[PDB]
Symmetry: D2
Subunit: 283 residues, 4 copies
């Protein structure tokens, strides 16, 4: 499976979105699992989840790696509401467009925020909920904020360069030897191809700062069975937010990988794939 | 499989132990997994692990549920060293007696302390290490000590009664409806059958208090792949000790169950069985 | 200064309260500091704060040790709203009745919850805010709930006895040698004198459980300079709630005493008196 | 009081040190309080503590702001042991040279590590112990390591520039408006004046990495009354290490300032001065 062979577009119509173009990569044909990426410059569905799509499709799922509005090959957008909520409306838009009644959601960082908002706004449309260091859950009890990785994310958005890209990835990943030329050129190309996105993210972050993403107070409403994952060494979203979800969501469990940054699904792909497939099959 | 049909005895000879009688329950014939129980009055191998033995044997393992010295049907003993270390010597004693070169260890609370000490003292003799709220790892950063469950454990040892037994189990378990008459009569019978054990535990705890169990400083020596589990609602050993192990053991991961006390393997048996079998097979 | 010589009553009229009798103990004549007690059976202003009233009056303050509705010699009441809010209305009622424009508030546990609610509802009427292990601030990230001390508080309310009183105080205090016959007889007399209160607290806790006290989401509104204190060894309200306040209140600081339960102002009276007087004078 | 008018030198002879030149700034003539600075490039006694020396001398103390070996105007050195221990030997060297029997110690970051080592090695020679975010106390339960501020400290040591100096100070301080041209030129001058120091620190850090500083296991030996301070927003040493000290030192208390980085004594000078003077006088 490749990016090109799985690539598709659909136009969505939900709330603020009027014939809005969403790019996604799809493979398999069983029950739908939608995977949602983080918010750093150059992020997208395929580059975030290409180590997971095959094992999940092999397990019998239909995998959709979604480009969120204002990322990769989805349409440009300036948001005046918190991104989690706006992203969640796009997921619903996508699901209505494709005649998907219910989906399992997998979400990393911004995508975790998106998945949380989806489960809150559309409880009838979600199956299980897999959350990987979800962003925007308010203050940490230990970590000064903005987090180190968040400052680097904003620096790269404002002053894009290859060197700053590299500095950011060095913070996002625990194992530095995973930072190959392929990884760097990939993200770099995604940044170069659509400069509008970087500009629009910064404008959006002015209208709705990260403090406006906090849906902590509503976590008690989530009835979806929930699997929370964290990287022990995540410098982007703090580890105690894993406890926060575990205490506040009715039916949750927490799995923390050692030697792992913000991309558990990439840095610990085999173990991640096994744990989440097992959870989707048996929890 | 029943307690009687699996029941066996072996005499051990290791360090302080001279023809010391160890009771265990054994089933299956593949690679050996030894399971080690907690330290509360009436504890033993079968009653701690009877929901795990079948699924593990079905997965192809040889399961040994060991009675630790001074518990259940193993010989009475007064210890002058920290119990974790003395227990670990007994495990080695048992393994030498049965011609077992290497074992996977599963350990809850006191049994977690035992498993840690085994991995430190006999690194050549352990496979993987599964730790469920291991006891004795020093102070908590949050929890006042002695913990609520520890005070109840000492109260029941000093003044054994059925009512105090019930109070203790109400603290050990999250879901109170799991406290059946069968569970209570079981522990009660184990207490009544061998009063010597209760007396000896209290004498042992005078010679070597819980503060002497702390092997934190040596955690860097463990090269065994390690799976750490915790109950979110454990009132016996504090949750932050899960983080402590995760930060200090080279190759560890942490899994925390919601709505779960000190017996994860019993309160969340299906998920526990799946996660640990998957880990023994694939990590 | 004694309980009798400082004792006063005032009738309050605020929201739900119609000629409601509030007992308080008053000394000094400078700026008003109102001190507010915890919620355990037998609690009251004088017995909670008699080690603080003198040093504070000597520093030049007018000290009011308030009996909260449904405690000690204040009127009996059954509350259908969270106690923090109802208590805060009584403080305002008291201040209107006595022509006090502004007060510094000192609050322990339930009294901390009361002080928080006062600062939120009547920001124009508060000076500085001193919070000692305030209750009701939602879940802990570490501590299973209900906390050990909370279970003992409810046990004593439902089955009052001298022996259960003693068990509770043994948990509330770090240093057990502070539990004199004077302390025990004091609380015991307060319990015996007004059994209606115990009954009414349990009815009130049914109508508005502790989960309804959580004002976390509004902490950003507090503009009062705030001094947060905690006992390291508090088994009633969890230590991480000190961090929660410190992160969420604009101008806060946190002071944690070692070897200290839920009554810092009593167990570490000299240091407490010095720190809070210094704060009221100079912050 | 100025840097020049208070400036002094003494030659020390203790263990490894043979006629080793130590620079310090001294004022006052009552009981000795020695203040010890952090380890970042350009650090020294006067620039770290010039907001504290006056108020402390006014309170009646003799203040000594010590330059640690390999910093500011003290002699250059390459250390093969952990810096905390080597620094502590220098403090003793200084105290023997000046006929000081006992000193109160105030220590920030590296200076906190120094103060801890002094109290452990020379318990007869210390009065009270004031610790401000002490470095080297092992892993954090929450914070990935090396900490953000530590990476910036090593970057500035290896590639000294004015721009990198500014980036580091922006992380060390919470309030960015405190970063004046005076502050920057000060640190810059200290860096330019002695490049040997920067080189030697990096060599020393190779021989004895930060992991070798961990004296956690010996904290139970400290009988000095101890005042622990932390900045809530410290990105150099993690907040949970404040809890670690509070749990493990016999007689400790913890004070955490909001809106505060690694220099509490500078960022919150008035409150810091009041709290520590009160502690030295009355604890």
């Amino acid at each position: 499976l490749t990016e090109s062979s799985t690539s598709k577009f659909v136009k969505i119509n939900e709330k603020g979105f009027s014939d809005f173009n969403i790019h996604y990569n799809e493979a398999g044909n069983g029950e739908t699992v939608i995977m949602l990426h983080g918010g750093g410059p150059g992020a997208g569905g395929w580059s975030n989840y290409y180590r997971n799509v095959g094992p999940f499709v092999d397990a019998g799922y239909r995998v959709i790696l979604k480009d969120s509005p204002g990322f990769n090959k989805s349409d440009a957008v300036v948001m005046d509401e918190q991104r989690g909520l706006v992203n969640a409306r796009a997921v619903k838009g996508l699901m209505d467009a494709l005649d998907i009644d219910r989906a399992h959601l997998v979400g990393n960082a911004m995508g975790g925020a998106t998945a949380l908002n989806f489960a809150l706004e559309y409880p009838d449309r979600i199956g299980k909920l897999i959350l990987m260091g979800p962003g925007g859950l308010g203050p940490s009890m230990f970590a000064p904020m903005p987090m180190e990785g968040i400052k680097l994310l904003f620096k790269l958005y404002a002053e894009p360069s290859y060197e700053t890209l590299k500095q950011m990835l060095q913070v996002f990943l625990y194992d530095q030897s995973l930072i190959t030329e392929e990884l760097l050129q990939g993200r770099w190309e995604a940044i170069q191809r659509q400069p509008e996105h970087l500009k629009n993210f910064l404008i959006s972050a002015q209208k709705a700062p990260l403090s406006t993403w906090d849906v902590t107070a509503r976590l008690g409403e989530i009835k979806a069975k929930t699997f929370i994952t964290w990287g022990r060494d995540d410098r982007f979203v703090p580890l105690d937010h894993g406890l926060k979800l575990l205490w506040n969501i009715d039916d949750a469990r927490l799995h923390v990988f050692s030697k792992c940054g913000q991309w558990a699904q990439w840095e610990h792909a085999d173990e991640f794939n096994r744990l989440v497939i097992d959870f989707l099959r048996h929890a």
